[PDB]
């Protein structure tokens, strides 16, 4: 008989309407569970991770830590291969958090037969970390707590910067590009745009994007593939970030085309050790940030020392 007030979510597939204070929270895709956990809520189910951790564990250190602290269990969807609708349904969720995600219209329609879905605003994988919090927390009926979580996460970042005066000054205003450069094939590579949370996080640390990036912001993607032939377009970058290994930088500087790029020949390159918790953290969540920001700043400060 009682009709509690509704939460109405605007997103890429229209609207989601649910009753205030949903109890059982499922999440899907990268990082959304870290929002629930940061807000003190243990999901009845969330997506398995296999980047920066083994599929066997399927959970990152900061996530595992927060769960244990909340005296909870980790209920993982066996969904590395794709959404596991059966597993999601069996968790009997009152809501499904997908604020940062790549779901299609068909995914959305099917998930919605299980529970109300908090989808991304516009485009797949184009949700910045603050907006992930805004979307997911509003779905929980916890907008206010979400804003407070954003403010505390911003404070965490600011605190760590203040503790490293040299690094803070050294990276401030450096023009940076987050990329994916495969040393085993340099004919083409990827540049993440400002719409990608991992590129955008860098601006939270005081870095900026070079003007060259704007050429690639027009396409509706979180990343653009460009040929080595175009590599000279980004000679205005002070520093470049890429995933890789201890062989990556050497290989790049020796490359006939990539080796002529200013930041690369300068050694102004932060190589994130691939498939590590640190690599995972570069797509930030409120939990990952606290856990890794010191290590990340040191890596960034060190690459920026080489900028000329």
Residue numbers in the entry: 34 to 341
From the paper:
To obtain sufficient iron, S. pneumoniae evolved two major highly conserved iron ABC transporters, which are termed Piu (for pneumococcal iron uptake) and Pia (for pneumococcal iron acquisition) systems, respectively. The overall structure of PiaA is composed of an individual N-terminal and a C-terminal domain linked by an α-helix. The N- and C-terminal domains face each other to form a hydrophobic and plastic cleft.
A crystal from 2.4 M sodium malonate and 0.1 M Bis-tris propane (B3P), pH 7.0 was applied to soaking with 300 mM KI and eventually enabled us to solve the structure (termed PiaA-B3P) at 2.0 Å using the phases obtained from a SAD experiment at the iodine edge. Superposition of apo-PiaA and PiaA-B3P against the ferrichrome-complexed form gives an RMSD of 0.31 Å for 262 Cα atoms and 0.45 Å for 283 Cα atoms, respectively.
